[PDB]
Each structure stands twice: as C-alpha cells, then as structure tokens.
Nucleic acid binder design. Structure first.
Lengths: 312, 312
DNA sequence: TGTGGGATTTTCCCATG
DNA sequence: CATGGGAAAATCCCACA
C-alpha cells in the first residue's frame, strides 16, 4: 500500500532556535546533506501513489511518548506552528525550505501547548497519537472547521498539565503526516505518520556543534605531556574530551587523549591540556595524527585538526 | 561648622549587584580596605559635633549632574532603597555592613526612579540636589507636613523621563547625608552631603574583574613578534589592551603593547596576540617586566603578571 | 544556610552582501 | 532586508564551608 518516506532528514545539530523577540528570517532549517555551497532542505516522498496529496509537518517531543511540542514551525506555508504543503499530482517528492523553529519561553509553554492541542483536535492533526489516546475519534474532521465539547476541552487541559519536565525545549522532531484524497475529493485518508531524526538547538551547550577555533602548538613530541592551549566554541567542563585519533591501514584507529581537569576548561571556551603518547617512535620520521573535541555524553565530535608527532 | 567625613570608601570594583530574582544574602558591599581576614565596610564620621544624629545613604548616579539612581540599597537598616542609621550620642563613627545593591531591570527603571524621586521630595532627602533644582525648598520639614502638589508631580515625572534615558545601570555612588537636631527633637539641621567613590557592577562587562587567568608563554625575546595565548576573565573586544611595562630606577615606566585585532579576542575569554619589542634590543641580564590587561575606557588594570625578556 | 561564583535563558543588536 | 552570529540583560542554580 501507500506509505510516506523521508528522503532527506534535517540536520540534527547546528541550527539555532529563535525566540519570538528575535524576529523572523534568521535562516531555514537545513537538510542533513546541506553544506555551505549546497543549501539542502528536508525532503519526504510518498510511494505507491502518483496523485494529489496533502502533507502536514508538526513539531513533536523527543520522549518515549511522542506528544506535541510547544515550539512552533514558522515560514512559508506555516500556520499556528504547523506546516501544510501540497504533494503535487506527478512529482511525489516534497521539500521543506525556509522553515524556522520558534523557541517558546518556559513560562508561555502551557498556553501554547493547550492551543496547539486544541487546534489539532479541531483540525484532525493526529489527536490520538500526539495529544491523547481517547481523542483518536477526532481525526475524522469531515470537512474543515469543527466545534469541541467541554469534555474534549478538559482532556486537552489534562495533557496541557502533562507538560512537565518531559518537555525538553532543546530538542524537537519533525513528524510528517500524509493525506490521500477521499471519495468526496477531500484529503482525509490518513497515511502512517513518519517521525524524523531529532533536531537539537545549537544554543544548548549540551548539543551545540563542537569546534576547535585554533590551537597553541600545531605539533609536538611523543616524549610526554606537552602543554597546549586550545580555543574552542562553548563546551561544558564535565562533558568534554580531547581525542587524538590515527586512522590505520587495517581499518582500526589509534586513540589517545589529552590530560586535563574540568578546571582546565576556562569559562567554557578554552582548554589547557597536555599531549599524550603515540606510542614511542619506530619510524623516526614525524607522524600526521588528528585531534578533535569529543562530547562524552552523545559521543559527538568536532571537525578534525591535523597534529604532528616528533621523535627524540 | 560641623561636617561629614568619609573614613573608608566602598570597594570600587569586585562587588556584584543582584537582581530581585537572585534573592538576598549573596554578600555585603565591602569597604575599600576589606580583605579575607578582618572584614571592612564603608565608614563615615561626623566631625565638629558630638551627640545624636541620623545618617542616610542614597544611591546616586556617576554622570555630570548627580541624580537619584534606580538601583536600591537593601539589607541592614534599609527601606525603600535608602539606608537610615543613627549616630552617637558618644561615638560619631558609623559603618555600613550587610549592604546590597539591588539591580533594577531596564523595564522597571522609570517607575522606580519616579517613586524614588517622590520619596526624596516628601522626606526631604535632598530633592533640590538630586531631583530638580526648583524643588530645593522641599527641605525636611515633618513626618506628614508634605503632600506633593500637581506641578511638583509633573516636574518629577519629566525629570524621571529625562533621567531614564541617561542612567548607567553598571555604576552607582553612595551619598551620605547627616541630620542634626534643631532645638526641638527632630533631626532637621542638614549637614552638607558627601558623595563616595563610584561602585561598579562586577557582573557588567564594562566593569568586570580584569584578570589574566593564564598565559602559554612567560618568557620572550627582546625582539617583538612572539605569539602568546592568554586566558582571561570576560573582556570586551573593542575595549581591551594587553600592556607590558617596566618600572625604571629613575622612576620612569616603560610600556609596550601586545599587537592583536578585536577578532583575535575569542568569545570574550581569550586573546591571541603578538608580543611587543623590549626597551633595548641589546641586553645581557634577563629583564623581568610585568604584563597586565587594561580597559581602554578605564585605565583599570588586572593584576601584574611577571614576564621575562631574554637577551636572544 | 550564606556567600560567592558559574552557567543558563532570554533578549538585543551588529556585520555583510 | 535576509541571515547569521556575538554579546548583554535577566535568571537560575551549584559548590563549599
């Protein structure tokens, strides 16, 4: 049967969430394959069907129970924190460019969440899967705008209370839901929703892109701990490591680590450490190893930097 | 006649103002000569008079024209932002301990200022000197003998509008005013106020504690060129200098400066620079000079750190 | 349980084509 | 203006003694 597939995920790290106060037009959510001279965007495709379809995109939480998120989608073809796009008759690929992730404040979560949930139930935006189980009957909206009963409003209030610390404002996910044309012509046949990879706010220090701005000594000796000053982007002192790796011909990689205490991390932006061994010098010619920053929690690495090892 | 003397000024730098949200008991404003062992506080003394008196402490601005400040005084013997203590009848020296400088937010400056002005007019806490000249007749006349009139209120409102646009929230000053009895019982005879030195918010970037945490090089050639990585507390890229200096036997002070661009200041917490040339490019005995950070708008310097120029 | 200090959130603003 | 990015303003929280 018909199903929805994500052709290109969004980039998990690097994108910055914007609060309302920061204004609009700060850049769209890049796709996973996007580089500086190849602006790519998230892309989905509907398979086993060539015809008209309606695709909606919602921001969902990153917890075990995938629920709605208080952050909003903004940009072209966005309304009330949700994106809606026409999957054309012939071309079944759909890209999402110029999308922004509006970062709600901790205070204004509840209200926002409530509204979103309400709109979902009022528009059939997967009220059963995301808002609450017993609301699954509100998916068949019929035409467009409906009316809600007080019992339905109090279930929404209940899940609006659910918004406890299980709401993580530093990570969201894209959920894409397709809709096939009904016998009446309306776009109501719901396909299976597909969740994308988790997008992390680059302003979160636990999930920012690690980067070595510049290093003190570009080379060193295998003799022992030679002190090096490394200027980097924002890292957390208790979650950061400096890894020297060496790619080998057998497929394996040699690992060494710089020696430093969390106190040696100066105000999250610089590290003073000591270089490790190699081990020893067999080939008296210098060796071209690499060095990078590695986050201990998620094993995320920075772009490599060419380091050199000297003998006696 | 009798007058007021500042025995010990408040500490100019290093004290952190606190917002309402940060709660109290974060530390008291120390005097200039305070250290770890043996604490010290601002101290005033009434001279050419022995007996009962009352001393008030107000927060004033550091501009050309002295005005009331929107920041408040909190702590021992504080109310409505003003500190009120008694002096005497034997000891004419009063110290002020457990004082805190409450940092108003920018949103609540105007209203706060207005209120302060009003109070200063009603209690006679120097309205002519601090609020507006024509309000000089509102001298301390009685606990209720003053209800402000409409023209006075409009003068206060216009002064608050104009002074909100000028107020620097990173610096305040203490103004001490002494009041002596009036052959009646109340303390109305106003001794001339005395203004203290400026007090800078150590959390503000333009007044933060200048400190060199560490350097990757402490020695250098007397010829200028060596690159040094310097890890420092928060500085501003366009307002910071690295100053080498040496005190001479004739009392002269030679100075050179590290060469760097604002882009060489890394996230306010690191500076990569090139070392300057020494006094004489021809020397034999190594020369121990000092190196310090200096703020361009301040001449305020960090602690001197040794640096050995080598005769090459 | 007070005292500092660091780090996080929110907001503001600049550089650049 | 459209984008990025750095930094200031306001808030929260933790270590330590």
């Amino acid at each position: 049967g018909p199903y929805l597939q994500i052709l290109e995920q969004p980039k998990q790290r690097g994108f910055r969430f914007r609060y309302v106060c920061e204004g609009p037009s700060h850049g769209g959510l890049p796709g996973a394959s996007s580089e500086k001279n190849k602006k790519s965007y998230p892309q989905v495709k509907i398979c086993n069907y060539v015809g008209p379809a309606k695709v909606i995109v919602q921001l969902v939480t990153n917890g075990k129970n995938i629920h709605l998120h208080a952050h909003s989608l903004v940009g072209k073809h966005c309304e009330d924190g949700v994106c809606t796009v026409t999957a054309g008759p012939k071309d079944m690929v759909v890209g999402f460019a110029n999308l922004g992730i509006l970062h709600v404040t901790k205070k204004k979560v509840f209200e926002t969440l409530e509204a979103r949930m309400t709109e979902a139930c009022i528009r059939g935006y997967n009220p059963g899967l995301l808002v609450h189980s017993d609301l699954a009957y509100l998916q068949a909206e019929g035409g467009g705008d409906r009316q809600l009963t007080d019992r339905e409003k109090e279930i929404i209030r209940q899940a609006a209370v659910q918004q406890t610390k299980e709401m993580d404002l530093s990570v969201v996910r894209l959920m894409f839901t397709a809709f096939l044309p009904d016998s009446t012509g309306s776009f109501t046949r719901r396909l299976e929703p597909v969740v994308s990879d988790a997008i992390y706010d680059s302003k979160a220090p636990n999930a920012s892109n690690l980067k070595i701005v510049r290093m003190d000594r570009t080379a060193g000796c295998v003799t022992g701990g030679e002190e090096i000053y490394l200027l980097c982007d924002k890292v957390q002192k208790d979650d950061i490591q400096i890894r020297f790796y060496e790619e080998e011909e057998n497929g394996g990689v040699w690992e060494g680590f710089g020696d430093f205490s969390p106190t040696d991390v100066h105000r999250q932006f610089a590290i003073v450490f000591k270089t490790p061994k190699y081990k020893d010098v067999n080939i008296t010619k210098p060796a071209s190893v690499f060095v990078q920053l590695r986050r201990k929690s998620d094993l995320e690495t920075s772009e490599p930097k060419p380091f050199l090892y000297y003998p006696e």
